[PDB]
Design a protein around this ligand. Structure first.
Ligand SMILES: CCCN(C)c1nc(NC2CCN(C)CC2)c2cc(OC)c(OC)cc2n1
Ligand SMILES: CCCN(C)c1nc(NC2CCN(C)CC2)c2cc(OC)c(OC)cc2n1
Ligand SMILES: C[S@@+](CC[C@H](N)C(=O)[O-])C[C@H]1O[C@@H](n2cnc3c(N)ncnc32)[C@H](O)[C@@H]1O
Ligand SMILES: C[S@@+](CC[C@H](N)C(=O)[O-])C[C@H]1O[C@@H](n2cnc3c(N)ncnc32)[C@H](O)[C@@H]1O
Ligand SMILES: [Zn+2]
Ligand SMILES: [Zn+2]
Ligand SMILES: [Zn+2]
Ligand SMILES: [Zn+2]
Ligand SMILES: [Zn+2]
Ligand SMILES: [Zn+2]
Ligand SMILES: [Zn+2]
Ligand SMILES: [Zn+2]
Lengths: 269, 272
């Protein structure tokens, strides 16, 4: 039987609660990390927060016209009137998104502020059959909807190079990383799928320091209620981890299962 | 003859929890636009604020932070907020302590009892044209003593930078090296609050997402019950008036006014 073990893993820091349930095993709600809703720093990074360094728009409407400078910074604003990615949006090679900011002339409710407005969908941390904890939707989610941000500890690549536990690392684009092992949000629990239903997009909001894009997950297709969320962790992850464990996503397109790995090595010979 | 007109529906452009409208029933001055409204402090040079999460003092509370064991409350002797978010009656309004609110490192939840200022504006205010002092800010409702009103928000600048700025009419001094909040070019609603010699709000230094003591955030709390329609005002202090008295005098109208033309003249006469 599935029981609601924690009413909100985010401790009230998100717009909506994120409960945790486990109907698979005896594992209690995870507590070996610190939930944070926004990225943190553990060393001197000096993110460029100078307000005069922000590119910004002069719109006095809702930023829905093609004349919005912030939209032009990403070719065009990719958000429709409902805050969802346009359907033409390149989900294979996503552009950088520049949302409106505190230097823009527009109001806080304009159409170019989806990610900075936070989580709106109902998500749940749940125990999966084969992959530990995972995150699933508690509602239908149309294609192009903002889900959540990959939040954690900002670290340099040199620091990432010496960290033991690399299971919760997201590479940003000298390069930096978000390590969600010790400090992270709900995204640290999202598993890898070889047939993913969310995609990461690099976004700029209150600063435009190009070393530190913020990573926003949007649905790449319609997601049904109860479906597990997953993104493609990529080849760096799997080149490292395949020798320790194999993919359990179960897709017919799986490239990282024990079977898939074995079939590739057999054709080598 | 002259009617009160609503000139701006919200000077904050939706950035606060509530709209802050602007009205004028005094003169023909339109909504002020010679500044940029920001709801949080901005930086225009490298300030190197200590934002390292491991440097935060934080509590281990598993309740709502109402117990005497909350470290964050202990950092100010005690938590000074009652269950409704208002300062205790014993709060020292003459020399207020530093307040350390709970933060992202504390074990407690976002709704604990020690998070008043970080939750933003809750009272209903209005920017309005005063009779003698330009724009001012007044209450649209009764406000009990001890209630958080708004933060003094603007551009963080060094003492050396403040020393070279022409317009010093919107400066709040923070105090090693010293910093200032300049609300002339970037500011929130607080930039429009006038000076009162009998003030009804007091500034309190508060720490929230960081604890870099060079950069307290300035929170105004009511020092007494405030009536509907009453203009808000704080004591700008002697540095302001030592500079400005030669250009204009106080129009607050209090019998206790210490900066009016009359008060200045009576001091000149007592020398002679
Ligand atoms: C420029 C790349 C930033 N760097 C250094 C890095 N390092 C990883 N891992 C190791 C960390 C420990 N050292 C002993 C060797 C390298 C790593 C592992 C990832 O997933 C298993 C991953 O997934 C997206 C990204 C990763 N990124
Ligand atoms: C930490 C910053 C300390 N500093 C430098 C400062 N300077 C002010 N003014 C002047 C600026 C132009 N220089 C040529 C001379 C000094 C000044 C004026 C204030 O109100 C009229 C005030 O009110 C609270 C605070 C002020 N603070
Ligand atoms: C960022 S975490 C995801 C949350 C994790 N399941 C947990 O319980 O904390 C990454 C780890 O989840 C597991 N995992 C994620 N995707 C997987 C997959 N497709 N197949 C097998 N294990 C997976 C692996 O242990 C991986 O190192
Ligand atoms: C920070 S501003 C306050 C908002 C200002 N009234 C406005 O219209 O922008 C400070 C200036 O307001 C005016 N002021 C504020 N308090 C005053 C007072 N008690 N008596 C006369 N003028 C005052 C002076 O011009 C002063 O330099
Ligand atoms: Zn715009
Ligand atoms: Zn906009
Ligand atoms: Zn904009
Ligand atoms: Zn797979
Ligand atoms: Zn506490
Ligand atoms: Zn607390
Ligand atoms: Zn605390
Ligand atoms: Zn006065």
């Amino acid at each position: 039987t599935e029981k609601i073990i924690c009413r909100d893993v985010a401790r009230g820091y998100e717009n909506v609660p994120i409960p945790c349930v486990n109907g698979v095993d005896g594992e209690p709600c995870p507590e070996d990390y610190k939930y944070i809703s926004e990225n943190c720093e553990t060393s001197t990074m000096n993110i460029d927060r100078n307000i005069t360094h922000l590119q910004h728009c002069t719109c006095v409407d809702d930023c829905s016209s093609s004349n919005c400078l912030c939209g032009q910074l990403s070719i065009r604003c990719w958000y429709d009137k409902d805050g969802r990615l346009l359907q033409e949006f390149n989900k294979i090679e996503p552009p950088l998104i520049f949302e409106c900011n505190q230097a823009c002339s527009c109001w806080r409710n304009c159409k170019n502020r989806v990610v900075q407005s936070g989580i709106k969908v109902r998500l749940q941390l749940y125990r999966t059959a084969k992959m530990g904890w995972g995150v699933r939707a508690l509602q239908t989610i149309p294609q192009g909807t903002f889900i959540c941000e990959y939040v954690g500890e900002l670290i340099s690549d040199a620091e990432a190079d010496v960290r033991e536990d690399d299971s919760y690392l997201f590479d940003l684009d000298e390069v930096y990383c978000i390590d969600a092992r010790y400090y992270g949000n709900i995204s640290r629990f999202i598993n890898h799928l070889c047939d993913p239903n969310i995609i990461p997009v690099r976004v700029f909001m209150l600063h435009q320091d190009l070393r530190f894009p913020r990573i926003a997950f949007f649905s790449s297709r319609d997601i049904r209620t109860g479906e597990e969320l997953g993104f493609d962790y990529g080849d760096r992850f799997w080149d490292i981890k395949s020798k320790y464990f194999t993919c359990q996503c179960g897709s017919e397109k799986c490239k990282h299962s024990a079977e898939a790995i074995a079939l590739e090595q057999s054709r080598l010979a």
